[PDB]
Amino acid sequence: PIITYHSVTVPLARCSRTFITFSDDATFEEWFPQGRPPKVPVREVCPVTHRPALYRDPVTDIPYATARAFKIIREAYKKYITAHG
Amino acid sequence: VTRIERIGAHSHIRGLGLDDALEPRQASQGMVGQLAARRAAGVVLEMIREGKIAGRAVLIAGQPGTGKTAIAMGMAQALGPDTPFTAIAGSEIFSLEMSKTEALTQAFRRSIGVRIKEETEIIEGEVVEIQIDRPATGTGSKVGKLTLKTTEMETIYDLGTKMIESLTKDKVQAGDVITIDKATGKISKLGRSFTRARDYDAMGSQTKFVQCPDGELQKRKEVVHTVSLHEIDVINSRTQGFLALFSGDTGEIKSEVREQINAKVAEWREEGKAEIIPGVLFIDEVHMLDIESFSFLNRALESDMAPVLIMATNRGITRIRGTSYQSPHGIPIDLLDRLLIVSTTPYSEKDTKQILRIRCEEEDVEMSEDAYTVLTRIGLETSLRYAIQLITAASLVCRKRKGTEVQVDDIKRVYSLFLDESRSTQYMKEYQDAFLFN
Amino acid sequence: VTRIERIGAHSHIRGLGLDDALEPRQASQGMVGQLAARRAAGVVLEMIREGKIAGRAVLIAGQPGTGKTAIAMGMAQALGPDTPFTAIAGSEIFSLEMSKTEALTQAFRRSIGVRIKEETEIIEGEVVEIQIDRSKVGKLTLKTTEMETIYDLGTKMIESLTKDKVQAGDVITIDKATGKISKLGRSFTRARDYDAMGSQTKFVQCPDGELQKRKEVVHTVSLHEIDVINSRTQGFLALFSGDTGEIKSEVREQINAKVAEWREEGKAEIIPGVLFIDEVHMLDIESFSFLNRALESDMAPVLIMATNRG
Amino acid sequence: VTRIERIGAHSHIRGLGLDDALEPRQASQGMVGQLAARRAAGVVLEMIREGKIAGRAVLIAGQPGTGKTAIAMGMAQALGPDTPFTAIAGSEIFSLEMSKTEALTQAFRRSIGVRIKEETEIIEGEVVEIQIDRKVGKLTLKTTEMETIYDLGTKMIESLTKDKVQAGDVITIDKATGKISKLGRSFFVQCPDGELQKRKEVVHTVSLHEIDVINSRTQGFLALFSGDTGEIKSEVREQINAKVAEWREEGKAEIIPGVLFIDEVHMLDIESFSFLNRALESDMAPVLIMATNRGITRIRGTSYQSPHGIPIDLLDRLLIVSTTPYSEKDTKQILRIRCEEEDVEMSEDAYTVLTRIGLETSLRYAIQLITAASLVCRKRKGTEVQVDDIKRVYSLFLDESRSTQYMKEYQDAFLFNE
């Protein structure tokens, strides 16, 4: 499996052109994955204060933007643990 | 557009202006008059060109403004760039990094050139097609093929790994006129024979093309490398010597290194590998050297690697620096016995006018005959340099009033505006108490 | 107890003893007599405090024992510690490392203070967990007494965390703009009862409040300090050793321009001060010639001098 | 074969030539005459060897060519190599690497030695077999009387790998350090005879300067060979002095005060003299010996006249030993000793003529003429130097007086005459 770099002289009175040849399709895919454009992440919002989210409590995975919001989320998680068990 | 080199004090001096018999012409190559001194300078120049006698010293002595430095610059211009010419001032040998003897040694050895001439095989051609095959992943042996073309030849070369790496580093493409040295493998691109493909973007404006080389592909060319003894000493003193060639900071080079280098250069000369190109060291205002420097010069001129030494001084019987001894030219008699002295006579009226005419021609200034007469009278009364400066000053004054030719009125105006030493001293005497000390 | 500052030759001087009209009192703030000299010193002090005029020179001349150094110390005391007051003797400019003109330039630039003001956003918390999958991508959990969140790390952040050997229980701050990580301390747990501690470890309380914080730093530095910082790669070391050498004039011009830019941007303020040279008669003629044109710059402090020579 | 130490100016001096009562002999150990100076030097030597009084200074003063340096060299020879004897010239303290006071401090501290005795185990033998396996290894060594196999550790295995050791080499190993030095091969040095492992007592005399330089910085011992000491801080020197006092109190070391000799002391300036004035007042100061031929002369660095170019404050701390000019008999005996040193045979008439020449001009001039006359005699295939050879070399080589006369004859031809 090789990559062939080729430069030729071809009439246009002459112009220079360069070509790159891949022996196998695996190398071509590896060098050119043709990746689709990435997606813009959704701007998460704090369920407690509705302000734009700035943090992410690891235990509950609930984004929040206020210390009071964190306390409320942790109280809700404690109540959920007490109820469900 | 103005180059880095502009009209200076000696910009009009293109040579000594001598004929085949070393007879000075009255006005040629910028030099006017000083016939005896120019003839002596020509004899010294022939001695330098012959390059057979080491450690010859010449002293150009005369009154201020008599053309000592003009003669030195004429000798330098007549020698040409092939022969080394180190021009330094006497004050330059006083250095905080090295001793005075070390500075003098470096000045001497900057005036001797070592030339190495060798023949190498050279490939120069237009790249037609280059192909490089490399493994997709991991270490492997690159295989390649290169086609080169001249007006009368075209050969396809099988490329090795290191030549492949060199071509890849140089980014050699089709249409590039490249030079390959077979021994070292160095590749130098010297142009493009035609443009690249137009459909490519972000390529920039294409420059002019270069005609394809003619003749055979693999030629044999003579390569000449010329360095001075000082450069060899510096690059051999220490590993960082190549950087010391530019930053200075050479310190004091061991005498062992210089002795070894002298021996090796002698061996090369005997074996025909290298030729020694003796030059000139010109110390302007040599009276600033002290007694120790003169004593070092005394015995340093006795070496076979010493160049021709040319000194200029305008001193009479003056105290030698570092001593309390009065000597001619400020130079000890022991050194004065080792050197030939070239005297410069003062200039007459016609010589002064001719020098002024040459200066005006150099500065592209048009002046009237009456203005030339007045300027010559001022130069005879005051000095030559004052008249030379008034040339440009009057040119500027004339250009200010939308004129074309420098008249007597402009010369009078610049004479009023700018003062010489004599009138300044008179005006300082008139207000002596106002000035600070004495 | 006995502190390092003890009764000296001018310990009794606390000021120039002037009223609001710069009229000297007969005995106030530890100064007696010298009414005309004290009034002149007060005028010079008002000139210094205004800061409008640059490169003004005053010479305190008189017989030995007449209060010249007393007046200089009174001026220094009356002037706040905010305004620089570089007091040197004439003999101190003769250095084996730098020229006399360089010594005088450094003395001049030590007398101009630059008060900087930088506001920077930081993240501050105690590290709970660091998980790195494989040095490619990872997560960092930070906590306060009132907060806790998890962060996604990149390649450079992971490399910086591994270089600093940040582990659990460490209280660190991270600069948002530059990403540099400095470790403040580590939290104390029952399992961290070390018998021997390293020279840099120290135990601190877990930070309170919010994980994102703003850091405001205000400090006064001189032009000479900025010159020494920017002279070489670790030039701040020369601010301790003094092996500054002769700083290039281009560096000084660049630093003057940069300081002017900061002053325009509001990130710095200039506080011109006083350079006091005691026993100036020890200066050489070269030093006086340099002083002639050094005072003519727009970044020249007030030069107060004192000699007792006839 | 020609070794480095050839015949010098004081090669014949082997001591002071004194009896048990410090009474000098007329001719002994290369010394002739100057009984009073030699007796004073012997008293000073007894003072040096006693080692109780510190910083005592003696000045040998006298006319040029009166045995001052001869007395100093005889004092150095009478002391063994055990006692330090630092000999410098006055010009040597002027350095671009350090200050004059630093140079004199290093000269002083070079003259005080610290003698430390320690015991080490040294293994010296011939290698029989060396085995290293992937770490463990075995080594078999033999002498002419015993053979042994050793089980090697990791550090000794590494040391033996670093220094290529193969069978047949004769090596010595310092057990505690692994210092292996190959001293030849045997099958060229003979194999060691006795026990393979020997406990040896090694004694080192280390100067205070050496301790300071070794402890000044990491790899600081290199400065003992390349200068580069800079100016050692006073804190390091005080700490070293304190530690040496602790060693002396604890019995770990003994102090061996020595002698610092400054030939041509008059080259020192006023600053160096003032420094010596107080440097001699320390308890670690050595015995200072100085030589000068100056009369009432300007002290360098000042405009003052003083008896020897030494200020009187220093002179008040010195004991001065005066050397007297030599007689005809003493001159002849010195010439005989120098001839014996140079292996030159002269006739008695030649000796008489040479003694007259030495009295008329200088003793050193006659000593110089001895070798020239020997060479002239060897040129004409002779074996004994005659009066004709001495006259020939007298005509060939001039003295100061005749040179000055000839120069005054042509004073205009010379350069810069006052």
Place this chain on the structure above:
Amino acid sequence: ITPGICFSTASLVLRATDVHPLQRIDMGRFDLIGLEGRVSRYEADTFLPRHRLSRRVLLEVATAPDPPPRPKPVKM
């Protein structure tokens, strides 16, 4: 090529500057140049004056039992 100079000295000389830890004070309490490039103004001025430990807090943490295990993350 010459062998190097082997300079032999007393083993006691290499320990001349060495001082036992029980005989010397900690010089790190005067280390100002060591703080440069490592310690920030925030730590010295704002953080440490507020979040210095106290003897009471240290004793409380040491005497108190081990904290409860951290709950596992739950996707909620």
Place this chain on the structure above:
Amino acid sequence: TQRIASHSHVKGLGLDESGLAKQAASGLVGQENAREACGVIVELIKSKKMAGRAVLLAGPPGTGKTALALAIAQELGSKVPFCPMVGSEVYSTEIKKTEVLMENFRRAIGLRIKETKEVYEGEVTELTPCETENPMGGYGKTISHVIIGLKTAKGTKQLKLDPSIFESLQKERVEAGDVIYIEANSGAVKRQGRCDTYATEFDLEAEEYVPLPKGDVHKKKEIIQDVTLHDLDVANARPQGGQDILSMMGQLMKPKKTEITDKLRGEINKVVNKYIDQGIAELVPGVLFVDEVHMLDIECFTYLHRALESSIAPIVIFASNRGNCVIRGTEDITSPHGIPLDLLDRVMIIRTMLYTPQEMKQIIKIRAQTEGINISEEALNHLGEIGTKTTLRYSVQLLTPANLLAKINGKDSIEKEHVEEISELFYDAKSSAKILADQQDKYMK
């Protein structure tokens, strides 16, 4: 800039279009002949065709020599280099005096470099090879172009580039959504981070996320860079930025000025000439002002002859207020300005005269205007009378203490009483000298 220095009022030479000097213009009063000569010198500097010309400003102290030099500098402008220097500066502990002088000479010769930098900015939206329907060699796939889509704030463009750029793209690890810039003059791809639109508030990277570039995808501008020959000399003598052991040593070791060799300077001259011929650069010869030239020693003066005789030297302006003084470095050699007659033969001397009382009053009024000080007519006349005795510098230095005293007294203008009180408080040189002479026994030495 905001602080007022001693020459803050000098805005140039007050010359008419015909070269005649106005009595009071551009902050300068009197000195008409010196101003006319300085205007001729300014024209000489602007002509750019002369090298090594020297001008000496000679006159009693406090006559505007430094003011005239600064007026010349103002006339030339910031484009023309102006290197001020005092004579005491040649005495350095690192390099020799001649080296300091040569370095200042190279500092005075400036070079202006003009280049066009063409770049392509954008966020990579598309990365698609352009395959060929006929693969070379029969097997595999061959590519003839790589289409890169670049997106900015106000546009989106596609660039068909050389196939060789695939290696740069892989080396830079450029993917979709990354912000890159491609330089036309080099054909290289540089990844300046990833777009900020793909960053979340929970990310912790610092230099990874960058804003989407503003403006057009294709940005080209003309870059004008002003450098001096000394800048290039220093950058080549002690280079910074290498990764070899020598660069590490240079960073570690204390920086030190070195004696740059003539070889490096000749190489720099060759490069400058090549740039000038190519049209890249334009030479800007400026002025070297050496104030207090009398502080130079005989070695410096001797070197100045060769320095000025060179064809690369700038136009040097000297200034000396000395009379028949003894040259430094020589034993009892007296010259008219402290300068040897050999160097005086190489200079044009401009004489500055003393000021009449009216001119002193005008200069005081100008200085008061510059310092923001309102002064009454009677106070101005009294201060000018004070300036008739003593000196002009004393009078111009009494303005700000008097303004402060008036402000403390509660007045917005300086009255005569304030000037009298300030004169009582502060002594001039002559009064102090009289005091010292009257009490020479009580003073020291």
Place this chain on the structure above:
Amino acid sequence: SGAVKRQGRCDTYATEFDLEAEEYVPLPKGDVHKKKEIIQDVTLHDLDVANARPQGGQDILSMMG
């Protein structure tokens, strides 16, 4: 400070090999934990020179320094 100095091997292991380049030291006599209250005099110059140059440092510039 946490400084560790390895002052040799214990003499109980001196016979583990017949020839090693090791320095064998007796077992310490007192307790493992040793406390001493000391009074040491330093001068201001000692602190000045202690803060003039950095000490230690694993960086390349520090090592070359």
Place this chain on the structure above:
Amino acid sequence: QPVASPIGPRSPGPSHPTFWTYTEAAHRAVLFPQQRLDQLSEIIERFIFVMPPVEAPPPSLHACHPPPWLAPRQAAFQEQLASELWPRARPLHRIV
């Protein structure tokens, strides 16, 4: 870091003002030591010949019972310095 030089610092991109301040012409007029070595390759190959007459290793300090920590510390210091600096000394190989 490159304060007051024709060479500009590493500008992040065209968004930074430093990108449009410095020129490539000024950069090409300044040569790094590696560029100087590449420029003087033929001179180095042909003209560097001086060898010291004698070559010796540095003096070694030997004690019977040295502090057992000095040698490992020196070895570690040398190892770290060599590992950090030897790759940077490869360009000087031909000169050596």
